[PDB]
């Protein structure tokens, strides 16, 4: 099974924003071979923000 679809509109836009941010201001550790727990964490932060 596959939950994340990194080719759609919203996922690709979010990933492009993250890539621009990481180009300008580095993160702690890169996202080499992106997993799905990263997407779940992003969605959880968005859930807390929305609530």
């Amino acid at each position, epitope marked *: 099974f596959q939950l994340v679809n990194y080719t759609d509109t919203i996922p*690709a836009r979010i990933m*492009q924003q993250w*890539r*621009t941010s*990481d*180009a*300008r*201001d*580095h*993160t*702690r*550790v*890169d996202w*080499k071979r992106p997993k799905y727990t990263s997407a779940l964490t992003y969605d959880g932060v968005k859930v807390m923000a929305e609530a």
Partner: single-chain antibody
Framework: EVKLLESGGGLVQPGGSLKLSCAASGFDFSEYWMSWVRQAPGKGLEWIGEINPDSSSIDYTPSLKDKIIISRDNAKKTLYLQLSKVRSEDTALYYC????????????WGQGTSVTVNIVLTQSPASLAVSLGQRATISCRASESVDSYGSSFVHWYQQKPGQPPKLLIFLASKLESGVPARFSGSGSRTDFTLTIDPVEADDAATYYCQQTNEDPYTFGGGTKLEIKR
């Protein structure tokens, strides 16, 4: 390790717009965004343009933004920068580079060429010379912090005149891949340091400490290294 090709360095006519062929061979500029930097003779490099991987929106140099426009395409993996009102000092060595943030092997800048039409740091010692097999430790003092966003956010580019610059050490945790250099960022590094051991005739070049932790990435003065016979 991605490979780049940049050829055609030649003068132009007064103001005659120019363009350089920066081909990203064996890879695509969608996995590592392509950025064009500009280094004059005997001076630190300057970011001429930062582009996007998905070919959505590119930037321009913070010095003269509207003065130049650099087009590029991910699938084509070929970029071309243009400008107008070309002056003498405007003819500086422009070089393409891939995004180093993806991997260490991705930090593979193009060849680079010149024509005849930030970051603050100081590396020491400026005049260094040791025989083959020696261990050299250069210290690059700075004014900003020594680590940004968890780990270190400084790098060291091993450039040579007319040769493609290479990024040996970066972020004190990811040294140059493919050809692992014995020198790399280490320790707390209040001043960026790398203990090259053992040196060789191939590892003799100008090491310049450019810290990405101080916006923007600007190559500093650096320290010279040779092969003392």
């Amino acid at each position: 390790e991605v490979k780049l090709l940049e050829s055609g360095g030649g003068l132009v006519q007064p103001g005659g717009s120019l363009k350089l062929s920066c081909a990203a061979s064996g890879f695509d500029f969608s996995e590592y965004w392509m950025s064009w930097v500009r280094q004059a003779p005997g001076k630190g490099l300057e970011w001429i343009g930062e582009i996007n991987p998905d070919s959505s929106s590119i930037d321009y140099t913070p010095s003269l933004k509207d003065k130049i426009i650099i087009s590029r395409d991910n699938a084509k993996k070929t970029l071309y920068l243009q400008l107008s009102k070309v002056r003498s000092e405007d003819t500086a060595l422009y070089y393409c580079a891939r995004p180093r943030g993806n991997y260490v092997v991705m930090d593979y800048w193009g060849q680079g060429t010149s024509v005849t039409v930030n970051i603050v740091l100081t590396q020491s010692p400026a005049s260094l010379a040791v025989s083959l097999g020696q261990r050299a430790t250069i210290s690059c003092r700075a004014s900003e912090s020594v680590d940004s966003y968890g780990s270190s956010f400084v790098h060291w580019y091993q450039q040579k005149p007319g040769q493609p610059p290479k990024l040996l050490i970066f972020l004190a945790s990811k040294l140059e891949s493919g050809v692992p250099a014995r020198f790399s960022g280490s320790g707390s590094r209040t001043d960026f340091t790398l203990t090259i051991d053992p040196v060789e005739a191939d590892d003799a070049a100008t090491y310049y400490c450019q810290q990405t932790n101080e916006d923007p990435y600007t190559f500093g003065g650096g320290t010279k290294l040779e092969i003392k016979r």
